[PDB]
Amino acid sequence: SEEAFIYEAIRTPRGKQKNGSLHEVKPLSLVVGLIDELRKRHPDLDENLISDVILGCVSPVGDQGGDIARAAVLASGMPVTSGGVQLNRFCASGLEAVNTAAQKVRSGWDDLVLAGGVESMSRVPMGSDGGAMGLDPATNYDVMFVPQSIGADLIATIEGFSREDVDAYALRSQQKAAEAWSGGYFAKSVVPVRDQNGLLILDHDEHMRPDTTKEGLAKLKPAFEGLAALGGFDDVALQKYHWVEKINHVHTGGNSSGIVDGAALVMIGSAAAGKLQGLTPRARIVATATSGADPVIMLTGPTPATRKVLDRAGLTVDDIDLFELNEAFASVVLKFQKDLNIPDEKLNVNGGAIAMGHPLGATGAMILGTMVDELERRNARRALITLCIGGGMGVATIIERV
Amino acid sequence: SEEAFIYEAIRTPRGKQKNGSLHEVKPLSLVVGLIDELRKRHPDLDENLISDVILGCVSPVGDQGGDIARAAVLASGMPVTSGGVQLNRFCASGLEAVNTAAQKVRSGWDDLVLAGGVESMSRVPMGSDGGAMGLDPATNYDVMFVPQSIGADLIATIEGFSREDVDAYALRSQQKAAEAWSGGYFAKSVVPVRDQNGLLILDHDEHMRPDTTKEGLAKLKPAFEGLAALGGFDDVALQKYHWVEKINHVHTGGNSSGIVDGAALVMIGSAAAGKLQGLTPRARIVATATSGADPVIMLTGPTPATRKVLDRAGLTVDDIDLFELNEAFASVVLKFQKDLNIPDEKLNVNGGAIAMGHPLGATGAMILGTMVDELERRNARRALITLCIGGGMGVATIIERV
Amino acid sequence: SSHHHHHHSMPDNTIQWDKDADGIVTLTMDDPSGSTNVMNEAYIESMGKAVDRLVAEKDSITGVVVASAKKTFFAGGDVKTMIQARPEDAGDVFNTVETIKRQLRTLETLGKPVVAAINGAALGGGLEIALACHHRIAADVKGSQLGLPEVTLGLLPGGGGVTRTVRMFGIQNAFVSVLAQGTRFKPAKAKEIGLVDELVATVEELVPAAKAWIKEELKANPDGAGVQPWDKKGYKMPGGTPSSPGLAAILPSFPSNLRKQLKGAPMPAPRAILAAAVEGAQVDFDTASRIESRYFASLVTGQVAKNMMQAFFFDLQAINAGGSRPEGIGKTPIKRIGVLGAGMMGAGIAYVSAKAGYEVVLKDVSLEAAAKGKGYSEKLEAKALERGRTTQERSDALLARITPTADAADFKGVDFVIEAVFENQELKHKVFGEIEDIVEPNAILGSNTSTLPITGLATGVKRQEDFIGIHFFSPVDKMPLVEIIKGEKTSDEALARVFDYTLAIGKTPIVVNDSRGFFTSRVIGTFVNEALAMLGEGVEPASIEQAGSQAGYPAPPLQLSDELNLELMHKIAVATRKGVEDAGGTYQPHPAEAVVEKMIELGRSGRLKGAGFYEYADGKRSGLWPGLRETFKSGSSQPPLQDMIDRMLFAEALETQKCLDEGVLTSTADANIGSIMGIGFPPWTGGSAQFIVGYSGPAGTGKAAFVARARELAAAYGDRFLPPESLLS
Ligand SMILES: CC(C)(COP(=O)(O)OP(=O)(O)OC[C@H]1O[C@@H](n2cnc3c(N)ncnc32)[C@H](O)[C@@H]1OP(=O)(O)O)[C@@H](O)C(=O)NCCC(=O)NCCS
Ligand SMILES: CC(C)(COP(=O)(O)OP(=O)(O)OC[C@H]1O[C@@H](n2cnc3c(N)ncnc32)[C@H](O)[C@@H]1OP(=O)(O)O)[C@@H](O)C(=O)NCCC(=O)NCCS
Ligand SMILES: CC(C)(COP(=O)(O)OP(=O)(O)OC[C@H]1O[C@@H](n2cnc3c(N)ncnc32)[C@H](O)[C@@H]1OP(=O)(O)O)[C@@H](O)C(=O)NCCC(=O)NCCS
Ligand SMILES: CC(C)(COP(=O)(O)OP(=O)(O)OC[C@H]1O[C@@H](n2cnc3c(N)ncnc32)[C@H](O)[C@@H]1OP(=O)(O)O)[C@@H](O)C(=O)NCCC(=O)NCCS
Ligand SMILES: Nc1ncnc2c1ncn2[C@@H]1O[C@H](COP(=O)(O)OP(=O)(O)O)[C@@H](O)[C@H]1O
Structure with a gap:
């Protein structure tokens, strides 16, 4: 309502x-x-x-x-x-x-x-809370627990992303983050x-x-x-x-x-x-969506979540002005870009967690507010925010300028 | 919607x-x-x-x-x-x-x-997660952190509930919980x-x-x-x-x-x-609501939360067939009953946490499903579930049989 | 990064460098601008040069010894500078303590042994320097003290005192005594609790023992030489860190217990010390030190620190230096003392006089009563022999000086008289006449009077000059103030002889010109009268007591109004009414008088009768009287708690101003310390006179904000809160 x-x-x-x-x-x-x-x-x-x-x-x-x-x-x-x-x-x-x-x-x-x-x-530090998926051998053995880093390197291996490819994206994030700060x-x-x-x-x-x-x-x-x-x-x-x-x-x-x-x-x-x-x-x-993907890679969640939030909002990739995906790892962003054919000039336009950092519990609200401000600056209409999640989960959100 | x-x-x-x-x-x-x-x-x-x-x-x-x-x-x-x-x-x-x-x-x-x-x-055990309100002196000194127990004793003191009055409720909680198990x-x-x-x-x-x-x-x-x-x-x-x-x-x-x-x-x-x-x-x-009261007497939360969910659902106390308030402390249920004039035959009719226990994270869902079964067994319509919360919070939910 | 205050763009040198043939460097602190070493801009630059040199010559230096060329080791921060720090100066204050601690941290991590040669007192910043050393040797000389008494001035140990003592002893042990209390320790006790590692007989043994420890340390453990325990990889904080399950279980009770001890008073220093202690124990040593600096800057730029630094440093030193003592007078040793009256006042005067080493003759109207007064000194020595504070040989030589008598002939040879009989001028005239001729000629004739003017009491004796007012406070064994009252015919020579006697029994003196009520009794009357008025107005008695405790008072007012007899308070109300009606005026009674007379009508006149505002069973308070609510219809008035607190504080601060206008007091220092040490004015205010210039509320801060709140209180509760004309403009 x-x-x-x-x-x-x-x-x-x-x-x-x-x-x-x-x-x-x-x-x-x-x-x-x-x-x-x-x-x-x-x-x-x-x-x-x-x-x-x-x-x-x-x-x-x-x-x-x-x-x-x-x-x-x-x-x-x-x-x-x-x-x-x-x-x-x-x-x-x-x-x-x-x-x-x-x-x-x-x-x-x-x-x-x-x-x-x-x-x-x-x-x-990360992991101070513990958890059964790591500190319980029965659960760890069943869910095939693998840290997020190994899944990221596995994505680069499967998708053919080289060391130069990921380092190239890391350079882009550092440069666009610097331009965003110096630009005010x-x-x-x-x-x-x-x-x-x-x-x-x-x-x-x-x-x-x-x-x-x-x-x-x-x-x-x-x-x-x-x-x-x-x-x-x-x-x-x-x-x-x-x-x-x-x-x-x-x-x-x-x-x-x-x-x-x-x-x-x-x-x-x-x-x-x-x-x-x-x-x-x-x-x-405009819309929110929760989905997920395999828990061993555990970083492919953004693609089915973004697909769901675009479908529920009655939108397509062409209707989105800015795409913001948390730069947990460079291969995660490179896969999301290849999967949905995101134009390069629409993706993480003001840099990301590689340059600026990833405060786990706060990142989702940080990049959400980054798109709120960039939509007003560019005078654009829509933006899609998404994050890869541990355990193979995915969350996406579409916001509209007012 | x-x-x-x-x-x-x-x-x-x-x-x-x-x-x-x-x-x-x-x-x-x-x-x-x-x-x-x-x-x-x-x-x-x-x-x-x-x-x-x-x-x-x-x-x-x-x-x-x-x-x-x-x-x-x-x-x-x-x-x-x-x-x-x-x-x-x-x-x-x-x-x-x-x-x-x-x-x-x-x-x-x-x-x-x-x-x-x-x-x-x-x-x-409770408190294993630490916390700033308790384990940080600057906050513990600014806020007047007092454990849930003293606030319960203070409730009985201000409202005039005797030791025999709280033991009287503890008795009927044990009796009603035992009768519920006996009746299947x-x-x-x-x-x-x-x-x-x-x-x-x-x-x-x-x-x-x-x-x-x-x-x-x-x-x-x-x-x-x-x-x-x-x-x-x-x-x-x-x-x-x-x-x-x-x-x-x-x-x-x-x-x-x-x-x-x-x-x-x-x-x-x-x-x-x-x-x-x-x-x-x-x-x-039907409706949910979240409110609260003073943090020192942190167990006065359920009273304004219940009024808020009743006003939101467009109901009065007489429209509710069953009231379910968690028996965290006997004086909390007595004050809630006294404030809203809850009929005793409508209050925690199958016993509560004094008899059966209070698993902090699950109690809210437990007593909710309790009223789902009781409304059906009695063939009644509406029930109101609420809990008193540490730090002075309060949450109330209204369900209706279908 | 720098060891200096400036990095751009001429102080004196206070450190003497001396490197011996072994490689040991002796840093001797000798500030030429004063008789003590303090942390002024000269010490900062001097220690900066020395630490820079210790680093530059690190290859030719094997150890360091920190010593002092004065009576005291180091006196700490410059109170004359810290009391001027404004809130805008929070950045400068933060940078100064960071620079001071940057120097000590470099000294602490040189990789070489550093020994502190504590010759005399090392208090505050002085002990913080020694705590930066790896070993501490203290001379067991007379008058030497060690501790971190920053909290007593409204500050905290901001030169690493909080951080290092927690690393040494843990959160709980460091906070309980040395930090939250700021207690000063003798060198023998300092070695026991762990603030000092070694003791020597004389100060000449220090540097040799310090250099010998360095030479032995470099041989016994060369790897751990110059490495504090918290700089080793396997360091374990005593009692645990805030993440340890044992400490985490009891940690939530530390702020609540501290809240209980302070009774809710607005004293921010212990709260900040506890916060800096716990927060510091959660991070590395360097990060903990920086947290300590921010809490220190929040206190120094505050107002409570100003008040407490004013009263407990400047005002107290002006008093203990003869500020009230007039001109110059030679000393007259006191051979024997004679106390009149064996009541709780006279028996208390006999105990504190003998505990200083004086012969006392305790007289009363019978031997049965004089022995019950000496039993007040016996019961204290029996409790002091269990705590281990006094020895049996000294406790017997103390009670031997108290001779309980009932005959006036035993006052032969008494050259110092202290009367403490009932409050009756004719009685004081009588009891002084029986003895004026038995005592020696030049004997001081003192009177422990509450309200009766000394000038009128002096006519009962022959020598009007030797008659003086020597006001003690109940109980005398604990209370530290003596209100010396000057009669119209009191000589300046008798003023000094009582001034010297007060310093001999280890008490603080103030000098007051004669008037009805003096200064203490007159002001403390306004405090208790304001509370009784609130009770008559219908304010809850529990709220009145809470407002009194949360104001900073040591005793809630209704409880204090039972210790003071309501019969005595009614006698004072009759005198003030008779005096105005004998001149033709119309006496305007205080609203408290209707409460005093109503309680007497009900037979509840205080603790002496066992019934007052509280109930008294088997000699102990058993809570407030339940009938008190029905009698005054309590609960009908529910004013803001801060309105009650201000009414009690303002009534005293305004009356203190009247005593200054009327010439009863000649200095604000006597007003501040006299209110703090006499009638228990809250220490955070710095005194009833400092409370005016240092008031802080929602209106603001300063004498202007005091008048605004005073007028706000006058418009709501009575014209007595109207500020005097001296406070205006
Ligand atoms: C990747 C990770 C292991 C790096 O940890 P780290 O070694 O402490 O990282 P640092 O950046 O401090 O050090 C990396 C090294 O490369 C250098 N470096 C890092 N980024 C650089 C850059 N952009 N350009 C040049 N050098 C760089 C550093 O200076 C350092 O060099 P050094 O080893 O000589 O000091 C850690 O950041 C990590 O695990 N992050 C991933 C997040 C994660 O796993 N989970 C969070 C939720 S997805
Ligand atoms: C109340 C509380 C302190 C009880 O702790 P406990 O002493 O371990 O509890 P027990 O159940 O053993 O009760 C103590 C005694 O009472 C007896 N007892 C308890 N309920 C009884 C009953 N209904 N009839 C008779 N005896 C009873 C027990 O048998 C036991 O006897 P014992 O002393 O020989 O062991 C604890 O349950 C508690 O803190 N709960 C309140 C909730 C709370 O603080 N936080 C949760 C979130 S609100
Ligand atoms: C040092 C001390 C223990 C013994 O002093 P003492 O030998 O009896 O000498 P006095 O008390 O007469 O003081 C002599 C001088 O030292 C000065 N002085 C002492 N400590 C000082 C301090 N912390 N700051 C500034 N000046 C100080 C006095 O103002 C006085 O100066 P003056 O003679 O020019 O007027 C005593 O002065 C004292 O208690 N110092 C307070 C230390 C403290 O609590 N510091 C807290 C902040 S770190
Ligand atoms: C606690 C400790 C100081 C004394 O233990 P102990 O000698 O076995 O027994 P007691 O505590 O009864 O010793 C008596 C003294 O302890 C002192 N004391 C006890 N607890 C203290 C504490 N937390 N802080 C400071 N002093 C303390 C008392 O003031 C007392 O002095 P007194 O004899 O003049 O009255 C000792 O165990 C120790 O040296 N190490 C513990 C940690 C520590 O160093 N704490 C001191 C902090 S300054
Ligand atoms: N500040 C107060 N001073 C005195 N009595 C109070 C105060 N607050 C509440 N009471 C007593 O409690 C009763 C109800 O107060 P209430 O407004 O419910 O308090 P709270 O809002 O703190 O629960 C009143 O009738 C009054 O007698």
């Missing part, structure tokens, strides 16, 4: 894993900083009409445990009626939180919802992180290496070739993909997503919710 | 914390068993039309980490497109999953969703847990003490007097509630919800989803 509109979409800068600026910052603080930025833009906003805060978090333990969404509501002084729920759908948790918020608005039983995610990977595209969306005294901690995406060259990327060594030998994950994958004789490990630290700290926040609401609080809608969420 | 229907709603027996029957059972195995029971009831269901598997889990770490919902999909051999997401809204997680699943179906972007929750509190009310929905060889592990709620007497409940020691003294939570609460001079610690281990292991699964879908798969609707999600 009702339509879900995106009124605000902000994010923090991403800080490196080693010697990172945000390493001293609690993950809860990254979210509260964004809540206060929303307050700064709408001081007369009646926060009592905000019925839920939905944050995605892949490692909800330690600093990120105990319903960090509820902690953000209480620590930021938001009304106690504003709820607060943490969810985890691996890499799409940020986008799934926005999707769940949109579906809640459409059902009529929610009016104004804050959605996004947080992930301080330098404070809470991210000025209003990236909210600088400050301390209790107002002192600056981080205002830019630290993981970026804008002076990246083709020769520098070729000197890097395969980062996941030792994880394949110590663990036999290569032999596990080839047991399912028996027609492949050997996995070509092409992914290094220069063509894979960066391990960074970050958080993003989006304000989704109905048209009546925006008119009541005097908010101007920036974009409309 | 699109009406959401409950087609199946099953649960496991609740095994106790100390020498419990389910302590040897991994939480993933509890969920898979309920999935296999859904297959036994519908051997020809095309599981490819299942869009998502949402599971509530309050301590998503260790055996319950790494997205146990996705682990349930992959381990049970479900289609790899069936998603899998874990959410955490403390005690509402089981009901919040069903509501989110219902809201997903209403948006039209999902067709058939499995919702529920899992919590093996004997394996993954739970024979259809409680799916016994079995090992990999088909041998029985548990087939009843082994936390029940059906021979409870009013004299035995009075012998028990207030189990939350050492916590509020060794941590000073009594003084922290009374700093916000300054007009209260002393907190009467009336809650013991016999009038509080029990620590148990359990899991629940609800199959929610659209009307077209049931017709295509031959599923017969059992109930319809």
Whole structure:
């Protein structure tokens, strides 16, 4: 019935894993900083009409445990009626939180919802929460557990993507990310992180290496070739993909997503919710879709998910102005581009996680807000956001400018 | 827009914390068993039309980490497109999953969703996931963090419930739960847990003490007097509630919800989803709501959440045939009954968590499926399910028989 | 990255460099601008040069010894600089402590042993320097203290004190004593708890023992020499990290317990210390140190730190330096003391006088009562022999100086009199007349009076000059203030002799000119009267007590109004009414008076009768009286809690201003310390006078924001909160 509109979409800068600026910052603080930025833009906003805060978090333990969404509501002084729920759908948790918020608005039983995610990977490393798919031999043996990196190298092996091919995309992401920053595209969306005294901690995406060259990327060594030998994950994958004789490990630290700290926040609401609080809608969420693919590759999820969201919205690839796929690994983006024949000038036009980083729980909301801003800048109509997910899952979303 | 229907709603027996029957059972195995029971009831269901598997889990770490919902999909051999997401809204997680699943179906972007929750509190104790609200002093000092128990004792103090009053409710919970098992009310929905060889592990709620007497409940020691003294939570609460001079610690281990292991699964879908798969609707999600109250007395959440879902469904207290509020603490049910003038014959008619147990992540889905069966057995129309939530939250759902 | 404050574009040198033939470098701290070593801009640049040189000459240096050429090792941060830091200066403050800790971290990671030669006191930044060393040797000299007392000034150990003590002892052990309390330790106790590793007899043994430890360390373990335990790969934090299951189970109770100890008072320093401690224990040492700097900058740029630095450093030093002592007067040693009255006041004066080493004669109206007063000193020594604080040989020599008597002839040879009889001028006239001639000629005649003016009490004796007011506080064994009251015919020589006596018994003195109520009794009356008024207005009694505790008071007002007898408070209300009606005026009663008389009508006049606002069974408080709600219709008035808190704080701060206008007090320092140490004014305010210039609420901060809230309180609760004309413009 009702339509879900995106009124605000902000994010923090991403800080490196080693010697990172945000390493001293609690993950809860990254979210509260964004809540206060929303307050700064709408001081007369009646926060009592905000019925839920939905944050995605892949490692909800330690600093990120105990319903960090509820902690953000209480620590930021938001009304106690504003709820607060943490969810985890691996890499799409940020986008799934926005999707769940949109579906809640459409059902009529929610009016104004804050959605996004947080992930301080330098404070809470990947895998800190555990899980049966890895730490249970019976489940691990059955699902043929293989880390995401091996699946990425397997995709490059099957699709014929060379080490130069993936490094070429890594160079493109670094260059387009640098052009986006120097062009001022991210000025209003990236909210600088400050301390209790107002002192600056981080205002830019630290993981970026804008002076990246083709020769520098070729000197890097395969980062996941030792994880394949110590663990036999290569032999596990080839047991399912028996027609492949050997996995070509092409992914290094220069063509894979960066391990960074970050958080993003989006304000989704109905048209009546925006008119009541005097908010101007920036974009409309057209359709969402959840699908998946084989869990050994576990990175081919975007293709069936994008196909489903295009079908449900009654659209085709030609109807989409911008395509945004999380750059978890270069081969993942190269396969998605080849599968749907995505034009190169439509795909990740402002760089991606290779240059800027991949805060697991927050990435989906970060690239969602990146397309909201680029649609307004380019004055384009539609964009499709999608992420590959661990476990072979896939989530996609189509937004429309307003 | 699109009406959401409950087609199946099953649960496991609740095994106790100390020498419990389910302590040897991994939480993933509890969920898979309920999935296999859904297959036994519908051997020809095309599981490819299942869009998502949402599971509530309050301590998503260790055996319950790494997205146990996705682990349930992959381990049970479900289609790899069936998603899998874990959410955490403390005690509402089981009901919040069903509501989110219902809201997903209403948006039209999902067709058939499995919702529920899992919590093996004997394996993954409460608080194992850490948390900023408790384990970060700056937040624990800004927010007035007081455990759920003191807020329950404070409820009885302000509202004037005596130790005999809360033991009186604990008695009728044990009696009504025992009468429900004797009358065979739970024979259809409680799916016994079995090992990999088909041998029985548990087939009843082994936390029940059906021979409870009013004299035995009075012998028990207030189990939350050492916590509020060794941590000073009594003084922290009374700093916000300054007009209260002393907190009467009336809650013991016999009038509080029990620590148990359990899991629940609800199959929610659209009307077209049931017709295509031959599923017969059992109930319809009329409306859901999320609200809250003061965080220090964090168990006052269900009162404004119930009013909000009644106003949204266009109903009054007299229109509801059955009220189901989780028996987290006896004083929480007494205040809810006192505020809304709930008739005693309509309140938790088959017992509750004091007798059968409170598996944090699954309780919401368990008591929901309880009302689905009770509405049918009584041939009644409407029931209202709600839970009191840590941090001051509250969630309420209204179902109608079909 | 730099070890210096500036990197562009002339301080004094405070470090003396000396490299011996073995390769050991002795850094001797000798600030030529003062009698103590502090962390001013001179020390920062001096230590910057030395650390740069330690790195440049690393190949020819084998060890370092940090020493001091003054009585004290190092006194810590420059309070004169820190008290001026404004919120806009948060960036400069952050960079300074980062530079200070960058120097210590370089000293700490040289790969060579560094020993601290702690000759005298090492407090705050001084101990933080020693904590950066790998070994600490302290001379067991007299007057030497060691600790991190930053919290007592509203700060935190921001030079690595929080970070390193947590690495040494764990979160719980470091916070409980040295951090949250800021307690000062003698060198023998410092060695016991672990802040110091070795002790020597004299200060000359230090540098030799320091150099000998370096030579032995380089031979016993050459791999671990100059490597702190937390810089080794297998480091395990004592008690565990916040991720350890043992500490994580009890960690949620630390802020709530601290919230309980502070009773909800607005003292942000312990909250920040605990946050920096736990947050720091979650990251590496360097990241933890940077977190510590941000919490330090949030305190120094705050207002509570200003108040506490003003009162507990500047105001307290001005008092202990003779600021109230007039001109110059020679000292007169006290040979024997005579206390009049064996009540809880007189018996408390006898205990603190003998515990200082004075002979005391405790007289009363019978030997039966004088022995029950000496039993007040026996019960304290019995509890002090169990805690191990006093020895049996000293506890017996202490009680031997207290001679319980009932005859006035035993006051022969007394050259110091302290009367503590009932509050009756004719009685004080009488009890002084029986003894004025028995005592020695130049004997000081003191009176522990609550309200009765000393000028009128002096006419009961012959020598009007030696008569003086020596106000003690209940209980005397704990309370540290003595309110010296000056009568109209009181000489300046007797003013100093009581000033010296107060310093001899280890107490803090203030000088007050004679008036009814003096300063302490008059102000503390406004505090309790404001609470009784709230009770008569119908405010819940539990909310009144909570508002009193969350304000920072050590005792809630209704509870304090039971310790003070409501019979005594009614006597004062009659005197103020008789004095106005004897001049023809119309006495305007305080709203509390109707509550005092109503409680007396009900026979509940305080703890002495066993019934007051609380119920008293077997000599202990048993909660508030249940009938109190029906009597005053409690619950009918529900004002904001901050409105109640301000009413109690403002009533005292305004009356303190009147005492300054009327000349009762001559210095704000006496007003601040006198209110803090006398009537328990909340320490975070810096005193009842500092509370005016340092008020902070929703209105703002400063004397202007104090008047606005004062006028806001006057418009809602009564014209008594109207600010005096001195506060305006
Ligand atoms: C790929 C990965 C293993 C790299 O880890 P890392 O070695 O710590 O990464 P760094 O970038 O710090 O170091 C990589 C090396 O290549 C260099 N490098 C990285 N990117 C570069 C670039 N664009 N140009 C030049 N050099 C580059 C680094 O400087 C470093 O050189 P060094 O080893 O001499 O210091 C890690 O980022 C990773 O696992 N990411 C994938 C994400 C993932 O698996 N899961 C998340 C969800 S999909
Ligand atoms: C209440 C609580 C502290 C009880 O802990 P416990 O001591 O392990 O619980 P038990 O069931 O063993 O109860 C203690 C005693 O009461 C007895 N008892 C409990 N229920 C009884 C009943 N209905 N009749 C008679 N005796 C009963 C037990 O037999 C036991 O006897 P014991 O002392 O010899 O062992 C714990 O269950 C709890 O914290 N639950 C409340 C919920 C909560 O805090 N968080 C969950 C989210 S709200
Ligand atoms: C150092 C100390 C232990 C003993 O001092 P002392 O030998 O009795 O000498 P005094 O108290 O007379 O002080 C002498 C001088 O030292 C100065 N001084 C002492 N500590 C100082 C400090 N931390 N900052 C600034 N000046 C200080 C005094 O202001 C005085 O200067 P002045 O004589 O020119 O007026 C005592 O001064 C003290 O308690 N210092 C406070 C240390 C502290 O708590 N620091 C906390 C912040 S890190
Ligand atoms: C705890 C410890 C200091 C003393 O243990 P102990 O000698 O067996 O027994 P006690 O604690 O009864 O010793 C008495 C002293 O301990 C001190 N103490 C106890 N716990 C303390 C703590 N957490 N911090 C500081 N001092 C402490 C007391 O102040 C007391 O001093 P006193 O004798 O003058 O009254 C000792 O175990 C130790 O040296 N290591 C523990 C960790 C540590 O170093 N803590 C000190 C932090 S400064
Ligand atoms: N601030 C207060 N001061 C005194 N009494 C209060 C206060 N707040 C609530 N009460 C008491 O509680 C009763 C109901 O208050 P209520 O508004 O329900 O409190 P809350 O909103 O905190 O639950 C009132 O009748 C009153 O007697």
